[PDB]
Amino acid sequence: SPLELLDTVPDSLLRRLKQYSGRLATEAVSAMQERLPFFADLEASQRASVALVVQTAVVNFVEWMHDPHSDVGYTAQAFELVPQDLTRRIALRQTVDMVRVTMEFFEEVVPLLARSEEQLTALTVGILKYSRDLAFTAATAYADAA
Amino acid sequence: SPLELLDTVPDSLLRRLKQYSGRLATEAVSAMQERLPFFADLEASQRASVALVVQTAVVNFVEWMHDPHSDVGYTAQAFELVPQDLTRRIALRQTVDMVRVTMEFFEEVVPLLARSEEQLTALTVGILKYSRDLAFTAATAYADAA
């Protein structure tokens, strides 16, 4: 089962992932700069903050992989946009575009840490499940706020 | 690569999937009735229309699996809510809840048609990728309308 696939992923790899989280987040933001026109227009301060959020997401993913409990995690950090709701009016579409590019980026990269096909498949399934599951929880959070 | 995994899925299985689409859509709606309290409160007409939409989604998934072109498909049917925008004011949250339950249901079921682990993994990856990719395109469509 695809669940049994997840179980096969060493803490080794997960530990490694959290270790490299900040690098990945920087690379993700670079990919955003390339793929999203408006992203290059953002302030360096804002770009940095986004990258922080990406980094936290990476860490949360890693925790989820350990216990997909989705309740043990209990780590829904929210300090994004604390300075300002839609800080500098970041546009709904743009934020979606950013989330997309982020998830696409991780779909491309995270499997590569795997050391074996089994682990590779595990990681591809894990990231895809998380990405979706996360986007769902985000969408519900936006519905709640509406 | 997870892409090579998709290539391994016979038209046999995909053809079968589209054939069973309406049954699946009915089963999905049953699962929605069970998991979503407000869904039981919907009119039989509306429930039926939802199931139609689910059915179309199934078919679109199958097409996507053949060519993940995402442009050849060119099949973004929209007659949902033609009678009424948010027909009978269906609530943003509720629609998200429905999409979630639908995708969860398909994540659970669609892999089972596979006849081999390779195909099973392919299907799990395929559905998870599609579900996410679809939810993204939906979210952008909602951002555009805002």
Numbering used by the authors:
A (entry chain A), B (entry chain A): 14 to 159
Question: What text does the study give?
Answer:
The crystal asymmetric unit contains four superimposable N-MabR molecules with a mean root-mean-square deviation (rmsd) of 1.8 Å, calculated over approximately 140 aligned Cα atoms. The segment spanning Ser83 to Leu105 appeared highly disordered in the crystal and could only be modeled as a coil in each chain. The N-MabR structure consists of a bundle of four long α-helices (α2, α4, α5, and α6) and two shorter α-helices (α1 and α3). The helix α2 (residues Asp24-Arg48) is kinked by approximately 60° at residue Ser34. The dimeric interface is formed by the last two antiparallel helices, α5 and α6, burying a surface area of over 1000 Å2. This interface is primarily stabilized by hydrophobic contacts and salt bridges, with 37 % of the interfacing residues being charged and 33 % hydrophobic. N-MabR was identified as a globin fold using the Dali server, an unexpected result given the lack of sequence similarity to any structure of PDB. The absence of residues for heme/Fe chelation, along with the closest structural similarity to nonheme globin sensors, suggests that N-MabR likely functions as a nonheme globin sensor. N-MabR adopts a “truncated’ 2/2 globin fold, a simplified version of the classical 3-on-3 α-helical sandwich, characterized by a 2-on-2 α-helical sandwich of the helix pairs B/E and G/H. Helix F, typically involved in closing the heme/ligand-binding pocket, was not observed in the N-MabR crystal structure, possibly due to the structure being in an apo form. In contrast, N-MabR elutes as a dimer with an apparent weight of 47 kDa.
